[PDB]
Ligand binder design. Structure first.
Ligand SMILES: *C/C=C(C)/C=C/C=C(C)/C=C/C1=C(C)CCCC1(C)C
Length: 137
């Protein structure tokens, strides 16, 4: 279906708690929470090939992958990882990540298109799940 589009954030829950697990100190967590409320996501989907651009006020990152094929990106706190995306259903995908170097919490993300037209992103570190909700621009 239609993950493709320009998405703007309307809600962000538990992001600070996620960063805390990931070792980010309090002042930076607060500033990162503020940056997250300006998050925008651009998606182009062709079959199971995805191009995804996630940006805030001063930063932009591009993610390109094909479902089922390993690729490299970074974790939320910015560490290089190897990632692999699989479908969980018609309109939900789940990404498992593995650190390229060292150790750290187990991280992952999911993206889901709901029947109400929302895009739901979850990001996980161990026990803690951040949920962000987007709507089309
Ligand atoms: C498929 C969508 C993905 C994997 C989204 C990834 C988003 C991030 C890695 C966002 C990170 C951010 C920070 C680390 C602080 C600034 C605000 C965010 C949400 C852009």
């Amino acid at each position: 279906p239609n993950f493709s589009g320009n998405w703007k954030i309307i809600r962000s829950e538990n992001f600070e708690e996620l960063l805390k697990v990931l070792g980010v100190n309090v002042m930076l967590r607060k500033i990162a929470v503020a940056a997250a409320s300006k998050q925008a996501v651009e998606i182009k989907q062709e079959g199971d090939t995805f191009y995804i651009k996630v940006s805030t006020t001063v930063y932009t990152t591009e993610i390109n992958f094909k479902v089922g094929e390993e690729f490299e990106e970074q974790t939320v706190d910015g560490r290089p990882c190897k990632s692999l995306v699989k479908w969980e259903s018609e309109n939900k995908m789940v990404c498992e990540q593995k650190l390229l170097k060292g150790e750290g919490p187990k991280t992952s993300w999911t993206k889901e298109l709901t029947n109400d037209g929302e895009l739901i992103l979850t990001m996980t570190a161990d026990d803690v799940v951040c949920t962000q909700v987007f709507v089309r621009e």
